[PDB]
Design a protein around this nucleic acid. Structure first.
Lengths: 147, 188, 239, 11, 42, 180
RNA sequence: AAACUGCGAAUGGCUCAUUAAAUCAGUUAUGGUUCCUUUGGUCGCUCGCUCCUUACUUGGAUAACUGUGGUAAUUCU
RNA sequence: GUGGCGGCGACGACCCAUUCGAACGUCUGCCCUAUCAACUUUCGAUGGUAGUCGCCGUGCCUACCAUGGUGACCACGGGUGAGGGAAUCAGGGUUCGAUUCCGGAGAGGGAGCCUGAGAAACGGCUACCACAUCCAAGGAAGGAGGCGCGCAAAUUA
């Protein structure tokens, strides 16, 4: 669709898009050069990030963030807010006195980039740690595998 | 009302008590730092011009230049405190008034001008010595240092001279040479 | 705390200083220096508690101000100078030389060395970065920076530095089979031979070591110091 | 009720 | 209603009895009423 | 007092916290620098660590860059036309970052006839490419250019930016006509 | 002696007037910031209209000091 | 000859690194209460864009937008001698051992202000409020514990 949906112009910061050229090169194709980066740690950039056109400064592949720290996994639980999702992590807490276990869970709000689509409720998601992007969000989605 | 009068060119001070309101009428309703022709003081003061440098009122409070009032105010003075100061306008309610003589009269005041007070200290820095004695670059500064003779009872007579500062000496030249050498060694 | 505290309580001192409890309330808080606070031996502690050359702090100060003690070839007058691992101390008045090496108990030990051996030291490479005008720079564990290093030197290696000139003579590469000693963790103070290194991207690497008696253990990459190449150490070893 | 405007009567 | 965008009529305790009504108007109430009806072209 | 602390805020679940300490020195806030158009008037501010912050209060000139032509020239500031954050900065003529301003076009013009020797703004081996879109040409005919500020006058004390061109220029022009 | 300059007083003491992840324990990040002091680096100039014969060193002041004073009153002035 | 070369120190000085740190985060894990079951948007609750301020990242804050965020796996609310602990080292006739570590705040009462690397100062100042002292009556200077058991010395040197 259209990427300009805010009051201010949405532009990818590291791309200069006003370079003048000859008319022969103008007639060919007005394709802006895309910026993307390899986040390392064996994770591959999805092709939609390279070929897409969305503007998101908090995308791990096309934005200005760094992934460092803990790499965690969970199950996607809620998809209702913009470019962020709510996931759940389950575990067992051990009681020494009764020598048994109890079920516990943790809820995490993580930033979801548009490069990941076809994401449904209940699939496995692996996220990586970054700087605090907001008051409650500190992790970015790195990989999604279907249920 | 007392007058503390000073002649700076000779550098002499004197305190004179004036009990007559008539002679002090000329100074009334005049501000600080203003030139006044003090002919009313007497026959000795013909053509003398004085400047009102400052003064103290009957409670001992000094006067300030800026404030324009007949009474006392509470200003912020030097981290500043509310000090009480007398206004600059000269009135009849002053304990003592200070005068600086700027123009001389026909006759001479027997207290101030007939004698002299010498300056006590000569220059110390070399350049100020040069400017005082009109020395050229070829002239030697150490030649023109003012010596102070000093003699006391029970002590041998002596003369003392200040230590010249900013004087070119072989030590300073050696230090400059050392700095240049250090620069050379770093480059090498 | 509200501000940085300049008074170290005696009991809050590092345990390997072997300070008693009843002597006083305070302990010498080490000055800032090349080594960390917890991984250093203060000059006063070395001079009055290990060697017994001095009896009180005034005696230590009097000894220091006569320019008799040298660390790494340079005279030091501050009695709170932090001395750390692999440090050379020369006392020409007594004709004595010492090298700080952790013992098997995890403490700095008095290790006398040959005066020929005291002319060089071993430093662990901590950082490599290119400075202005395309000049490579190497930063060691004892805060020494060196310009124009060998292009083959990388992180976690060891270099030999001559104390007189502060220049690298040779270096020991980080590889399996070399002699290494553990400088931190539960295996602190032990000597052995590197067996293998496992790499975890984005996390800590783990290195396995096996001693002369065949016991094997594992430590982190940051806690190991390459003493020598193969089974032959490049420095004299303690008892 | 927090947005209800009060009414006055001319005395 | 966020950030006080919508007017609210809760009692303000600190501003309570902040001033006392003082009135100095010479014109009498009957004269005030006649004037306002007569204001402008009205 | 202006505090930019965190312990005055409500919790994530919505509960409030009772303060355990009063304001600290490193959490201070300072009044905003509403930079106007006028004679150059700037004030220096001492900050944490002993460094300096240049707080510009009144500015009239600054250097701007013609990115496509790569020509940086120092020109006066004329007026404020558009602001993304609020219209009040437009009405009060306040300079903040990313606001759109009007600048004089004389130095760019003079450089253009000094470079290409082709007339501009006048009434009715890879070679040099002297081509200008219709919008910019009409802007020179009007004598004023639209520019976007890239620096923060409240922090660095100077107003720097670039001349608007292309689809960004078209978007901002559409906004300017839409607001009227 | 007096005065000018530099440094510290923010640590240790002492203390009756607040507080459930708010603090605290362990781990983990600085590629999102700050830093007195300790230690190690770095710290030279071709010409480029400034002309003819300050870099053998350039300018302006102020305390201590001398002297005249005021008030119930500071070492206030 | 207004020649040319020079040693060992002291102090200061731009920037990089290092040490001492300080400050914001990540993860992991807190006692009782459900006769507290719904809470947050009650001067922003969640997020998006642009900006101010700040040492920086950030609803930290302001303008313009969406309607979100948490919760029986117990959210939210209320409690809780939260002098007492926590730890640490050392030891043959059972340990009358030893020591540390803190949650903050204030300087007659609430505000404003000045310096420094580091304090919204254990220190100056102004206004207001409350005290109390000296005077020639004009004006000036200020910021804690003992007894009440027939019993007050360490409130020191």
């Amino acid at each position: 669709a259209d990427i300009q949906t805010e009051r201010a112009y949405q532009k990818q910061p590291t791309i200069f898009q006003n370079k003048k050229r000859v008319l022969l090169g103008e007639t060919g194709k007005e394709k802006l050069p895309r910026y993307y980066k390899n986040i390392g740690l064996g994770f591959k950039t999805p092709k939609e990030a390279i070929e897409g056109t969305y503007i998101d400064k908090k995308c791990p592949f096309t934005g200005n963030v760094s992934i460092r720290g803990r790499i965690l996994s969970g199950v996607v639980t809620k998809m209702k807010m913009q470019r962020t999702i709510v996931i759940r992590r389950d575990y067992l807490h051990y009681i020494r006195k009764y020598n048994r276990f109890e079920k516990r869970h943790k809820n995490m709000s993580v930033h979801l980039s548009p490069c990941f689509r076809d994401v449904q409720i209940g699939d496995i998601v692996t996220v990586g740690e970054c700087r605090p992007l907001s008051k409650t969000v500190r992790f970015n989605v790195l990989k999604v595998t279907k249920a | 009302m007392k007058l503390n009068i000073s002649f700076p060119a000779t550098g002499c001070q004197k305190l004179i008590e004036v009990d007559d309101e008539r002679k002090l009428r000329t100074f009334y309703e005049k501000r600080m730092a203003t030139e006044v022709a003090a002919d009313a003081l007497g026959e000795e003061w013909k053509g003398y011009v004085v400047r009102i440098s400052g003064g103290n009122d009957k409670q001992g409070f000094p006067m300030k230049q800026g404030v324009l009032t007949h009474g006392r105010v509470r200003l912020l003075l030097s981290e500043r405190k509310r000090k009480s100061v007398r206004g600059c306008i000269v009135d009849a309610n002053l304990s003592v008034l200070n005068l600086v003589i700027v123009k001389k009269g026909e006759k001479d005041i027997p207290g101030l001008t007939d004698t002299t007070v010498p300056r006590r200290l000569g220059p110390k820095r070399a350049s100020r010595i040069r400017k005082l004695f009109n020395l050229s670059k070829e002239d030697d500064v150490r030649q023109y240092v003012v010596r102070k003779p000093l003699n006391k009872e029970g002590k041998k007579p002596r003369t003392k001279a200040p230590k010249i500062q900013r004087l070119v000496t072989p030590r300073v030249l050696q230090h400059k040479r050392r700095r240049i050498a250090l620069k050379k060694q770093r480059t090498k | 705390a509200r501000g940085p505290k300049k008074h170290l309580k005696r009991v809050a001192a590092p345990k390997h200083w072997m300070l008693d409890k009843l002597t006083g309330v305070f302990a010498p808080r080490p000055s800032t220096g090349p080594h960390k606070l917890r991984e250093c031996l203060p000059l006063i502690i070395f001079l009055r508690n290990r060697l017994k050359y001095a009896l009180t702090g005034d005696e230590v100060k009097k000894i220091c101000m006569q320019r008799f003690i040298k660390i790494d070839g340079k005279v030091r007058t501050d009695i709170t100078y932090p001395a750390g691992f692999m440090d050379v101390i020369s006392i020409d008045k007594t004709g004595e030389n010492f090298r700080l090496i952790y013992d098997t108990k995890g403490r700095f030990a008095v290790h006398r060395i040959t005066p020929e051996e005291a002319k060089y030291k071993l430093c662990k490479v901590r950082k490599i970065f290119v400075g202005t005008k395309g000049i490579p720079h190497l930063v060691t564990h004892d805060a020494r920076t060196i310009r124009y290093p060998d292009p083959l030197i990388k992180v976690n290696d060891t270099i030999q530095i001559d104390l007189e000139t502060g220049k690298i003579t040779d270096f020991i590469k980080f590889d399996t089979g070399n002699l290494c000693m553990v400088t931190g963790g539960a295996n602190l103070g032990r000597i052995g031979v590197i067996t293998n290194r496992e790499r975890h991207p984005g996390s800590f690497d783990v290195v396995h070591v096996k001693d002369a008696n065949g016991n094997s253990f594992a430590t982190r990459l940051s806690n190991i110091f390459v003493i020598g190449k193969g089974n032959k150490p490049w420095i004299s070893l303690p008892r | 009720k927090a947005f209800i405007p009060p009414k006055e009567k001319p005395i | 209603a966020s950030k006080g965008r919508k007017l609210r009529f809760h009692v303000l305790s600190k501003l309570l009895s902040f001033m006392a009504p003082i009135d100095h108007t010479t014109m009498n109430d009957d004269a005030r009423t006649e004037l306002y009806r007569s204001l402008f072209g009205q | 007092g202006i505090s930019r602390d965190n312990w005055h805020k409500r919790r994530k679940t919505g509960g409030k916290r009772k303060p355990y300490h009063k304001k600290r020195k490193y959490e201070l806030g300072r009044p905003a620098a509403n930079t106007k158009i006028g004679p150059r008037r700037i004030h220096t501010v001492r900050v944490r660590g002993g460094n300096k912050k240049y707080r510009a209060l009144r500015l009239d000139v600054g250097n701007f860059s013609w990115g496509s032509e790569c020509c940086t020239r120092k020109t006066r500031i004329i007026d404020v036309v558009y602001n993304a954050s609020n219209n009040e900065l437009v009405r009060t003529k306040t300079l903040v970052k990313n606001c759109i301003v009007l600048i004089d076009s004389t130095p760019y013009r003079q450089w253009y006839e000094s470079h290409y020797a082709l007339p501009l703004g006048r009434k009715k081996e890879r070679k040099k490419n002297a081509k200008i879109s219709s919008l910019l040409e009409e802007q020179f005919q009007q004598g004023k250019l639209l520019a976007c500020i890239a620096s923060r006058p409240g922090q660095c004390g100077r107003a720097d930016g670039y001349v608007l061109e292309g689809k960004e220029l078209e978007f901002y022009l559409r906004k300017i006509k839409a607001r009227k």
